Design a protein around this ligand. Structure first.
Ligand code: ANP
Ligand code: ANP
Ligand code: N0I
Ligand code: N0I
Ligand code: CL
Ligand code: CL
Ligand code: MG
Ligand code: MG
Lengths: 352, 352
């Protein structure tokens, strides 16, 4: 059967697919047509139907996995369209994680003789993250940070070595936020979580601006000025609050200028989009900082698809974590941010 | 001059006024008419103009302060109307705190010969809180909690003794949130803060529902169902997430169901109001819990006017802090929640 790892989240399904490239002459003959059809369909298309996408830039080439050489592919589609995916399946051992492995268990079993193996989200995320960093991103670093994140004339993406990764705080920003403390390959825990995550950004932004996609929400936010909606320290003090080291530019009250009707009447949708992004991102950074201090961990890695094609939030996290921690914490990012659970699921295949 | 303490916040001005009740015959003769006019105006009205209110139920009667006996009064009005207040003044030693003591310093100085003494917000809040608890609320406890906050057939307001208050975590919910760690009467610090506070509730609620007052926003929220807007753990898993002790009813993504257009089209304004209240309140409780754990403090007292006439948020904090801390933390509340800075300012009068 094809080797697939699936993470069924609240919003997106992530799929990792290993395409063998060492198929011999005899193996090709023994391949049933449906298998050949699956492999050709997946490798010859980059859009699947109307909502599935293969992230070609993320592909790991010439990976050795389970004693075969192949390419590792990364594919995503909305959980809302999982019925289409299962219907296509009905017309294999599936290692699956995420809440949807439980919620849609009975649906996957409508595919005759399919064995569904539910795997723990935590084990899968940690195993997948550690594995991808270990094999590298086609020889480049999987992990990066923003150097000199305080100075914008100097701020630039730079590689970060995770060869001895422990300890590590992992902040998984999906629909909500889960925060993990990773002490070893076999010693890790979920510290806490918050419900102010990527789904809050997308849901509030949709209500406030009428945007109809994540990418559209980000494009709006790139054009906005969040200070039209937010109340800053200088709006309350007239300047800095020196006594507690609060700069005048710090947000004192997110959306706090929207208590005034005349300000609600002048704010643009782009301003509201940017205020929503800033509010959610700063809250994530602050919760990450508090957990890092409590866990006595100084490396904080952010994963999940809230940060996909979202450089504004990445740079805000890099700057905020450095600034508010007085340089004690470092924000770290990974190229395969949304896919670690799906990879970790795929890596459980030998257990079955 | 009249004895007044003022806390000029980003949203509300809070004023504490000591009315002497031991005025002798000779003292009454020596009283200038404007002073007599001020005292009669303040004690014979409960609404001042169109936006000022005296909170009569909070009055401390027959207090001994600075060697005089009198009544302590508590008065509030919107900071937006401070120009009216100053204009009425122009037609005294003023101890003032809050960001507006700095921002409006020059405005207060337009009152001839007025001496304005700016006092630190932190000193004022801690001093005022400790003082009011020490004198009691007319013989009743100033501090209370919700007993058996998990069981609604039993949950009830009960008094809490703060005779040895230290250590104490003070969570001040105003436009934003400030969190203080109080170790002694002279040893306290601002731990951190968040910008998701009362101004976020009021501003977002106004944008989402068109409400035009704090009280209207609360009335809407009392009628709503936040689960129409929020995505819960059971929406993602089909039930509880036992592995990490997350109940199915826990919010996984605030406003996370609003990523679906059909759900945005069916949600009511009351539902959005309640989701905004729940989102802000849960985030405050979670940040309070993380700070309490880091500070090794198990008593968490919530102050500020976000909780004024807001029993929903108080009960949510009481329940959430107890539940998520496995009973290790206790949420505490104070009858004079919005006024401690103004009292602490008034208490600085002998220094000048
Ligand atoms: N194409 C997209 N569609 C929807 N959301 C997107 C998309 N791209 C990025 N996002 C963001 O990514 C978030 C989902 O991140 P993801 O890590 O896939 O979470 P999830 O696994 O589906 N949810 P969870 O159940 O909470 O673990 C959304 O909340 C958006 O903020
Ligand atoms: N009558 C009211 N008008 C406005 N807001 C109210 C009112 N009553 C309660 N509130 C809530 O109380 C919050 C203001 O609390 P308050 O403690 O007075 O803060 P502030 O001191 O004015 N702001 P800050 O500068 O942040 O310390 C608002 O954000 C509302 O959520
Ligand atoms: C989808 N997932 C998830 C993500 C985020 C959440 C939210 C969370 O974790 N909460 C626990 C801590 N909370 C509070 C609230 C009040 C207080 Cl006083 N204290 N804590 C908030 C709710 C729950 C599931 S998942 C499977 O983990 O990836
Ligand atoms: C009005 N007041 C106030 C209230 C609240 C605030 C907000 C705050 O304190 N912040 C400091 C901590 N922040 C972050 C952000 C990202 C990260 Cl990574 N870390 N921390 C958020 C901003 C500031 C003033 S006041 C005078 O105190 O009562
Ligand atoms: Cl299983
Ligand atoms: Cl001064
Ligand atoms: Mg996920
Ligand atoms: Mg205040």
């Amino acid at each position: 059967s094809p080797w697939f790892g699936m993470d069924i989240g609240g919003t997106l399904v992530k799929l990792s697919y290993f395409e063998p490239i060492d198929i011999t002459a005899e193996e090709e003959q023994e391949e049933v047509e449906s298998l050949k059809s699956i492999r050709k369909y997946l490798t010859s298309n980059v859009a699947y139907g109307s909502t599935g996408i293969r992230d070609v830039h993320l592909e790991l080439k010439d990976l050795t996995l389970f004693g075969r050489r192949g390419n590792l592919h990364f594919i995503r589609f909305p959980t809302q369209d999982l019925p289409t995916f299962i219907q296509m399946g009905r017309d294999t051992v599936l290692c699956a994680t995420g809440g949807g492995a439980y919620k849609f268990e009975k649906d996957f079993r409508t595919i005759g003789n399919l064995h569904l193996h539910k795997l723990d989200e935590l084990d899968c995320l940690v195993k997948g993250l550690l594995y991808i960093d270990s094999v590298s991103f086609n020889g480049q670093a999987e992990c990066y940070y923003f150097a000199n994140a305080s100075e914008p004339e100097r701020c630039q993406k730079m590689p970060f070595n995770l060869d001895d990764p422990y300890p590590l705080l992992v902040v998984n920003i999906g629909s909500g936020v889960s925060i993990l403390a990773v002490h070893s390959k076999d010693n890790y825990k979920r510290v806490t979580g918050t419900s102010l995550g990527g789904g809050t950004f997308l849901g509030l932004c949709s209500l406030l601006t009428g945007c109809e996609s994540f990418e559209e929400a980000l494009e709006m936010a790139s054009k906005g000025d969040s200070t039209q909606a937010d109340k800053l320290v200088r709006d309350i003090y007239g300047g800095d609050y020196e006594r507690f080291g609060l700069p005048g530019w710090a947000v004192a009250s997110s959306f706090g200028n929207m208590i005034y009707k005349e300000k609600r009447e002048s704010v643009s949708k782009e301003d509201l989009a940017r205020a929503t992004l800033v509010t959610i991102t700063n809250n994530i950074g602050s919760v990450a900082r508090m957990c890092a201090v409590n866990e006595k961990i100084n490396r904080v890695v952010f994963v999940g698809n809230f940060l996909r094609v979202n450089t504004l939030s990445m740079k805000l996290l890099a700057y905020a974590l450095d600034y508010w921690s007085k340089g004690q914490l470092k924000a770290l990012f990974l190229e395969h941010e949304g896919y670690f659970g799906a990879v970790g699921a795929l890596l459980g295949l030998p257990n079955f």
